[PDB]
Amino acid sequence: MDPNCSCATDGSCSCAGSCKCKQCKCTSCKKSCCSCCPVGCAKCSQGCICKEASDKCSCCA
Amino acid sequence: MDPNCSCATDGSCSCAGSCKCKQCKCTSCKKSCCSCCPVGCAKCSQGCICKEASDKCSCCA
Numbered sequence: 001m002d003p004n005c006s007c008a009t010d011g012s013c014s015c016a017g018s019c020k021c022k023q024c025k026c027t028s029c030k031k032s033c034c035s036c037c038p039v040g041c042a043k044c045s046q047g048c049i050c051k052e053a054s055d056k057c058s059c060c061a
Numbered sequence: 062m063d064p065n066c067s068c069a070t071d072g073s074c075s076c077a078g079s080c081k082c083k084q085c086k087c088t089s090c091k092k093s094c095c096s097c098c099p100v101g102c103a104k105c106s107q108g109c110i111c112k113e114a115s116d117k118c119s120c121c122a
């Protein structure tokens with residue numbers, strides 16, 4: 001339940017993207033690296049390239 | 062054609078994952094953030110958590 005994930009660390013959590021974690025450690029959870037892109041974004045797959053403002057981004061299509 | 066992507070920067074590239082880029086800027090390309098996980102890995106979607114050794118990882122299922 002490190003600063004970045006508040007979940008149980010025993011493998012059992014089913015948060016599946018409804019958590020508020022920054023960097024969730026649950027295998028059920030596939031949230032995006034940013035608020036401006038879907039989790040599937042091609043330009044961000046090797047690493048997030050956006051500025052963490054939130055809102056909406058100019059670097060991805 | 063920055064240090065991290067060698068592609069043409071005009072939108073036209075169709076490398077689609079056959080490039081050697083570290084952080085490819087082409088919208089056709091969906092390579093993984095690491096060598097030990099598929100691009101779809103749940104634990105790495107908000108940010109890569111693995112150690113860049115390459116090989117195979119202990120943090121993801």
Ligand code: NA
Nearest residue numbers: 042043090091
């Ligand atoms: Na990409």
Ligand code: NA
Nearest residue numbers: 029030103104
């Ligand atoms: Na995740």
Ligand SMILES: [Zn+2]
Nearest residue numbers: 007013015026
């Ligand atoms: Zn969880």
Ligand SMILES: [Zn+2]
Nearest residue numbers: 015019024029
């Ligand atoms: Zn979660």
Ligand SMILES: [Zn+2]
Nearest residue numbers: 068074076087
């Ligand atoms: Zn390319």
Ligand SMILES: [Zn+2]
Nearest residue numbers: 076080085090
């Ligand atoms: Zn590429």
